[PDB]
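Suppose you are handed only these lines of text.
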Amino acid sequence: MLRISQEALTFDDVLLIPGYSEVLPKDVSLKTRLTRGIELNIPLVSAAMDTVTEARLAIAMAQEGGIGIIHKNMGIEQQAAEVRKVKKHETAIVRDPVTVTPSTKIIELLQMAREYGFSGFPVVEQGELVGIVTGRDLRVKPNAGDTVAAIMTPKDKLVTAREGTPLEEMKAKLYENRIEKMLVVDENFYLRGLVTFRDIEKAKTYPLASKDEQGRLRVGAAVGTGADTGERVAALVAAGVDVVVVDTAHGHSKGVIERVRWVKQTFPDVQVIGGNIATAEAAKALAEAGADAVKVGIGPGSICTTRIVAGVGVPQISAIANVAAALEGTGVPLIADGGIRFSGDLAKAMVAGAYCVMMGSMFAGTEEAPGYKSYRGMGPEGIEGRVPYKGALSAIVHQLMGGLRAAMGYTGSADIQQMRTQPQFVRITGAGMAESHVHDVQI
Amino acid sequence: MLRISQEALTFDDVLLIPGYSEVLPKDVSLKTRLTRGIELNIPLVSAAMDTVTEARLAIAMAQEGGIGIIHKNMGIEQQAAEVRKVKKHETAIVRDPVTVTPSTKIIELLQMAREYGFSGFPVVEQGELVGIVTGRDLRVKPNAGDTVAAIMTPKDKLVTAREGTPLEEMKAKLYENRIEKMLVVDENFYLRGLVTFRDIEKAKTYPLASKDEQGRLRVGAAVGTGADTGERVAALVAAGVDVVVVDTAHGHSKGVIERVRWVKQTFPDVQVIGGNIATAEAAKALAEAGADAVKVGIGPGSICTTRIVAGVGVPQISAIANVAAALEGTGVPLIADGGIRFSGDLAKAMVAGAYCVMMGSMFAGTEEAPGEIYKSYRGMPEGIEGRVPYKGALSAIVHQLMGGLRAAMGYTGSADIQQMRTQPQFVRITGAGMAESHVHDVQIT
Amino acid sequence: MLRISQEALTFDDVLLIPGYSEVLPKDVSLKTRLTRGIELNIPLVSAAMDTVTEARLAIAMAQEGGIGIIHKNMGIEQQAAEVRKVKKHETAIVRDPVTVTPSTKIIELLQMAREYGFSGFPVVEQGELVGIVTGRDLRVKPNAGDTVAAIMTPKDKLVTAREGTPLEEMKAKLYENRIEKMLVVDENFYLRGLVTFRDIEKAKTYPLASKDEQGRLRVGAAVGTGADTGERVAALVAAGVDVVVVDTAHGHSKGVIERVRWVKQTFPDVQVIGGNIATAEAAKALAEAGADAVKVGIGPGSICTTRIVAGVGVPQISAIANVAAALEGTGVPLIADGGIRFSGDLAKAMVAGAYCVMMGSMFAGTEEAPGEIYKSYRGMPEGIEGRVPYKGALSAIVHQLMGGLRAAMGYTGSADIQQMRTQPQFVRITGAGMAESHVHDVQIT
Ligand SMILES: Nc1ncnc2c1ncn2[C@@H]1O[C@H](COP(=O)(O)OP(=O)(O)OP(=O)(O)O)[C@@H](O)[C@H]1O
Ligand SMILES: Nc1ncnc2c1ncn2[C@@H]1O[C@H](COP(=O)(O)OP(=O)(O)OP(=O)(O)O)[C@@H](O)[C@H]1O
Ligand SMILES: Nc1ncnc2c1ncn2[C@@H]1O[C@H](COP(=O)(O)OP(=O)(O)OP(=O)(O)O)[C@@H](O)[C@H]1O
Ligand SMILES: Nc1nc2c(ncn2[C@@H]2O[C@H](COP(=O)(O)OP(=O)(O)O)[C@@H](O)[C@H]2O)c(=O)[nH]1
Ligand SMILES: Nc1nc2c(ncn2[C@@H]2O[C@H](COP(=O)(O)OP(=O)(O)O)[C@@H](O)[C@H]2O)c(=O)[nH]1
Ligand SMILES: Nc1nc2c(ncn2[C@@H]2O[C@H](COP(=O)(O)OP(=O)(O)O)[C@@H](O)[C@H]2O)c(=O)[nH]1
Ligand SMILES: O=c1[nH]cnc2c1ncn2[C@@H]1O[C@H](COP(=O)(O)O)[C@@H](O)[C@H]1O
Ligand SMILES: O=c1[nH]cnc2c1ncn2[C@@H]1O[C@H](COP(=O)(O)O)[C@@H](O)[C@H]1O
Ligand SMILES: O=c1[nH]cnc2c1ncn2[C@@H]1O[C@H](COP(=O)(O)O)[C@@H](O)[C@H]1O
Ligand SMILES: [K+]
Ligand SMILES: [K+]
Ligand SMILES: [K+]
Ligand SMILES: [Mg+2]
Ligand SMILES: [Mg+2]
Ligand SMILES: [Mg+2]
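From them, the structure of the protein bound to adenosine-5'-triphosphate can be written out as follows.
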């Protein structure tokens, strides 16, 4: 017998059916979950590819309400550093600010400012706050002396707040004193933190941003199953990563299942994603291993050769739906990874059961991406290619979310849970897809 | 008789001959002149086209050491306002700073700051300087009151410098007080100007910038010969334009010659460029009319169909050399306008005698050029409409163009622009030579 | 005045005129000179590009009767080591053979043989020759012991020849003893060298090979004018380089002229080439600086954008003839570098006066050229990056190039290179003539 399990469908095989709608696209909710423990304000994840996600793009994705997964084709220290870059970009309060002492030489401070990119340094003596020196102070060439003591704002002029003071109260004192740094101290005037105007303003600019409980942007990082995996995970957790993505070509394997279990056991406080998979049995296996989410996609990537080189794969719409049915009631989200060419595909991915969609090609070429711009597969199961320079990531995200919002309005879905569970597809033929593209007109 | 005056050559007809050299490309001088009275640190001018030069790109060109000519396909007041944007972008000292009164409401000031793009305002009541209010003050919600008086730095705390104080002693006092604005006053504490840290730093960031005597970036603006021209010139001069470009398809005409003369006589303190021309007799006519420079180019434009619609033109290498010969010894510069496709063409234009080169297509598509975007580029019928690829920041294109000129000067042994214009030699080539010059017989990656 | 020195011609502008001939292509001589002191059996040089010439291709070129110039985009020691690979590939006699001691462990020697690529080692203890150990001996696991002493051929069984013995009497003794290594000794049985059957056979297989006085293949190496140049030259000479190529974009400069003079004065026993140039005055300047040859070519390179980025160049046929005229009677050869697309171009270059021709693109993609592969070919910005088809063995390309030159010499009645350079004539043609020359009006299968 020719052993055929099912007919499997991809995005171009189906269209969403319009339904009665009372909620306009601009008014629907796009909030979803990446994992059991991480929420996203938009259902978008950037792929862990060396032409797509390093720190710069991961910051942008988090600011938009999604998240980026930093790729692993680099040294453990470099990946940890990239994760650190995202976590340190902004915060509710800098709890471990770089400090100087009164006898620190101004020349060191000038070099510190260059390397760090900021110029504000509390001045301490054995933990006790004794001054502050900032960019405007570093413009002063003092009459006498060559240390911080000669240009710092002295103790008697410091504006401070006690640990626990509300942010609004902290803001009023910042503005009244025409300063942009608030020194946070305890009852003995020991330095406990630093609040910056910049961080206040960044939070107001991106109120949708994906952040942890400390107000830091969220970020993920990929690991494999090779010999350096344990050391790599440890460095990423130490750098503050929110989610470790155990990311392989075949997640339904002993190696991946065992590594997912190991991360859950060794680092219980981090979220773990496992993949990639494309069947219900694989989803149950990874869920039983403790994955906080599964990533769905074997074959469909734009620059992916798996289906041609190995003959292996599952059309993505059916793969999503089979995984979603397997995980119904478990609380484990599924991330649809690969094959998204148009915003319309994203909407279809969501209606088939995805919680969020991972994309590579769509974000390759943006200003924030590493590096027309290069776009290559991470595998001999990938190819190297070119994508056009696309400008700022925000514009692509806006177009993708605009299409999803339009689809939710067309189907009457007011939020992601309704979009995932209520709308219906029609199955179409090759002719139906042609009618749905632009046809018979010069563009 | 078939009346043929000469054989005329264009860029692809000639190549520069290498010569014994002692100066490296990085060390040559690119300084030149746009007009009798305007110097440029690089020989680049952006074209007066509505897809190339408005204020944003003119600012960038001046910062790079060149200049932009603001186009005239817009209302008189709108063109003057674009000029004003360039002139007000930076300065050595703001001599007419916007001031407010103590009783001005904070909420009104907040909106003006949004509209003006700066938040620093000296506070004047009647004629007396009584405070200063800045962006950081405008963050304050005062316990009592809703006027500037409630959040301004008052008279007794103002940091000031007397008019004439060197700028290095003003900077020391700025830095000592951790402030970024210096109020300049006379002997009776009357406000005479405002110096900003931003302007100090902008000058340090772009030390090559093309600037006038007040430290303002230079800018030009195009005018035609139609009925509104007189008022347009007046409005542009009043806005501070450095050079008026009487810009027509045919500068060798009564219309342009008389208008150039009128500008020189009516506004003697502004520079005037006349064009476009392509012959020696035209160059002499404009010089006699008082032009401070001439613009050379009939036909060669990228988006130009003049040669095809009217059958008229002169290949640009010969046009440049003919005009340069006609103006030798007059002090009148010539600007080579149009036909530049590669940095190598720019070098050839200089050696043929150009003082600087005007370009449109190559700057269309930059971030600073007008338009949304893979950006539109159309002729200002004798022109066409088209698309060029989005090219990113202007600075990168300028860098490659000047790198090619620097290399050409190194190859010819030319240490500065004057030597490049007068000493190097061309060889004449065939179509085969041009093909050899270009990448040939290899797949390019 | 527009300063045009001449009309300059390239390959597609001219054709060779057939002349009365008595010598068949198969019978003409292709021998020529690379430099004052280096002869070549064919007029071919491979370019100093990182996609063309490292040791592997330089060996092949020398075996064919030409020479390779190893490129300089690599570390000083790495470039010297590439030179060493070529010089050590073959020899008349190995004068400094690697030796071992009786107590050297067999397992260590096995690894050294793997690293060295040969397995033949004279065995020396203190200063005395006491055995020889070879690949066949290293297959033996001795009953007792683990050192060379256990598997070597001992002193009493060594076959030796006295220094000076003709090579035909050494071969007879090699063959009589069914061995492939001859130990050369002096009057006190001290080791003076090692002769191998391989080297004997390599000389017989490539009787045209370009070799020095020691029977080693010739090789060149490129250097620039930067700060590390002095040490780079020293390292390359120490590795045995035959010719140093002071290789720059603009040889008519103080930088190159002074460096050429420095090489001639500091290392009088090495040949020095200077370039690149394209004029008579440049050729005389390099000859006066002491160059043993000049390299001609500014612009024509396949992957070269010099003409397009800088606007600089001289069509190659005229550049060759101008330099050849300048060097007539000096003894200084000229190498035509760049622009060769077809074997017919090579013939034209020779008749214009070249002594030999340097090529890059045509050798990129061969098995012997660097790189994996349908092979990369990029310029060493004034160059481009590209792809060329995988071309197989270098020998086949050389065979077709020399076949075309041989045919051209037969067509012109030129029996040798000196006659080809000095006697045949060109006709000047139009674009129509070039089109006629090329395959036209037929589908090609
Ligand atoms: N918490 C504070 N208490 C007292 N003085 C402070 C405090 N924070 C900053 N300052 C002082 O106020 C001045 C301005 O510092 P601030 O950190 O607001 O801006 P900056 O980063 O130096 O300037 P800019 O952001 O405009 O480049 C400096 O003299 C600095 O020492
Ligand atoms: N010449 C001056 N004399 C006295 N006080 C001044 C002067 N210039 C500015 N100040 C005051 O110093 C404070 C900071 O003003 P400044 O103009 O240096 O920066 P800003 O533009 O307000 O802040 P930022 O540039 O960081 O947004 C304000 O309280 C302002 O009133
Ligand atoms: N000059 C010599 N005198 C005495 N014995 C020698 C000499 N040269 C080689 N032999 C010996 O002859 C044998 C064969 O050595 P030879 O160098 O001819 O070939 P090989 O390189 O070992 O074998 P192959 O080339 O077939 O791999 C070895 O036992 C070696 O010790
Ligand atoms: N001062 C300071 N800022 C930090 C540190 N680590 C991260 N940051 C962030 O860097 C930014 C500094 O911005 P800002 O206060 O405007 O910098 P500055 O005024 O030029 O010194 C804020 O977003 C901080 O959260 C630190 O150790 N010290
Ligand atoms: N304050 C002020 N600046 C002006 C005016 N006209 C032009 N400018 C320029 O606008 C810029 C303001 O920069 P900056 O002082 O940093 O702005 P602010 O601190 O936000 O008020 C400077 O380059 C000034 O030269 C004016 O009337 N008032
Ligand atoms: N034995 C030996 N050969 C060398 C040395 N340096 C270069 N060669 C060359 O390496 C080649 C060795 O060839 P062959 O004698 O057949 O190698 P073997 O029989 O495997 O040891 C010859 O062309 C030598 O000229 C050396 O130090 N010792
Ligand atoms: O070379 C590879 N081989 C197989 N799959 C790949 C390779 N590189 C990336 N992928 C997958 O393809 C996804 C991106 O697909 P895209 O959004 O269609 O471009 C990634 O998130 C990976 O899951
Ligand atoms: O449509 C028109 N007809 C003829 N010339 C034009 C037209 N529009 C612009 N030009 C010229 O072409 C120049 C730009 O040429 P480009 O640098 O080759 O793109 C401008 O500076 C004008 O001199
Ligand atoms: O990028 C460069 N700029 C200019 N000339 C180059 C560059 N790279 C290589 N060349 C020259 O071009 C020659 C090869 O030309 P081809 O034989 O036509 O491929 C080299 O031997 C060099 O003289
Ligand atoms: K349609
Ligand atoms: K070329
Ligand atoms: K033919
Ligand atoms: Mg600051
Ligand atoms: Mg300010
Ligand atoms: Mg052997």
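What can we learn from it? Chains A and C do not touch (no CB pair under 8 Å). The two ends of chain A are 49 Å apart (CA to CA).
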